[PDB]
Amino acid sequence: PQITLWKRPLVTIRIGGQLKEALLDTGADDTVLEEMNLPGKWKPKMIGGIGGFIKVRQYDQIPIEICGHKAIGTVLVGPTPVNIIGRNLLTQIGCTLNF
Amino acid sequence: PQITLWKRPLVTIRIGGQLKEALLDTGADDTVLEEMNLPGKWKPKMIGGIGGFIKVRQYDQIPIEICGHKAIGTVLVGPTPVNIIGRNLLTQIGCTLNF
Ligand SMILES: CC[C@H](C)CN(C[C@@H](O)[C@H](Cc1ccccc1)NC(=O)O[C@H]1CO[C@H]2OCC[C@H]21)S(=O)(=O)c1ccc(CO)cc1
Numbered sequence: 659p660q661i662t663l664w665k666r667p668l669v670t671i672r673i674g675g676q677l678k679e680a681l682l683d684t685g686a687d688d689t690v691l692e693e694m695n696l697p698g699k700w701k702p703k704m705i706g707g708i709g710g711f712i713k714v715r716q717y718d719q720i721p722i723e724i725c726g727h728k729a730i731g732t733v734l735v736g737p738t739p740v741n742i743i744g745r746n747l748l749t750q751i752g753c754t755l756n757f
Numbered sequence: 758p759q760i761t762l763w764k765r766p767l768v769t770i771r772i773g774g775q776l777k778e779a780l781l782d783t784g785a786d787d788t789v790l791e792e793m794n795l796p797g798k799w800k801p802k803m804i805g806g807i808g809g810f811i812k813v814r815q816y817d818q819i820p821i822e823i824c825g826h827k828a829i830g831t832v833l834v835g836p837t838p839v840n841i842i843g844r845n846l847l848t849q850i851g852c853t854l855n856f
Pocket residue numbers: 683685686687688689690705706707708739740742744780782783784785786787788789804805806807808838839841843
């Protein structure tokens with residue numbers, strides 16, 4: 659589909675048994691999801707944006723469905739105010755910027 | 758153009774006769790540039806990002822040519838980690854997300 663940017667580009671994603679609204683975010687290298695207790699190995703990381711850094715847990719090879727499109731890759735989980743689909747997964751669902 | 762997302766969508770912008778590199782950022786409501794001088798009236802504002810809140814200077818009706826596409830609108834100047842072009846100007850240049 660085509661998503662205009664008059665409003666936030668929020669779409670429905672699924673991660674296991676949880677559906678969430680997340681931003682399709684070309685400004686994010688990696689995907690950052692709100693706090694959730696995912697299974698499996700992870701490692702700590704600090705990520706920075708406007709206002710400073712937050713601490714996140716990096717989980718690898720996590721399958722995420724984004725508007726019905728299949729993706730799988732790295733997911734950072736921590737106290738973000740918004741779920742953010744970053745470029746690592748945007749490329750996998752075929753997302754481009756066009757003007 | 759069509760811009761894929763395997764790399765950061767960094768583009769050259771022209772603002773006040775200066776060339777700068779900025780990130781096309783669909784997850785940003787607002788355009789936020791690193792510290793610089795712009796002429797005219799500005800208003801103190803605060804904005805929140807992933808890491809908390811910052812103070813910025815709000816400048817209205819600033820022309821920016823983004824990849825050769827003209828926009829005129831609100832520019833916030835303050836301690837962002839990188840220059841970001843947000844939806845307020847991405848809409849002006851006809852940006853959409855497509856997948
Ligand atoms: C370093 C470049 C950006 C600032 C990076 N950000 C993505 C960005 O899209 C965030 C994504 C975002 C969105 C909402 C809340 C928090 C973060 N937007 C943002 O800060 O926009 C601000 C300017 O306009 C305002 O509208 C939204 C917040 C304000 S981010 O969220 O901080 C971020 C995301 C992912 C990583 C890991 O790769 C690191 C940082």
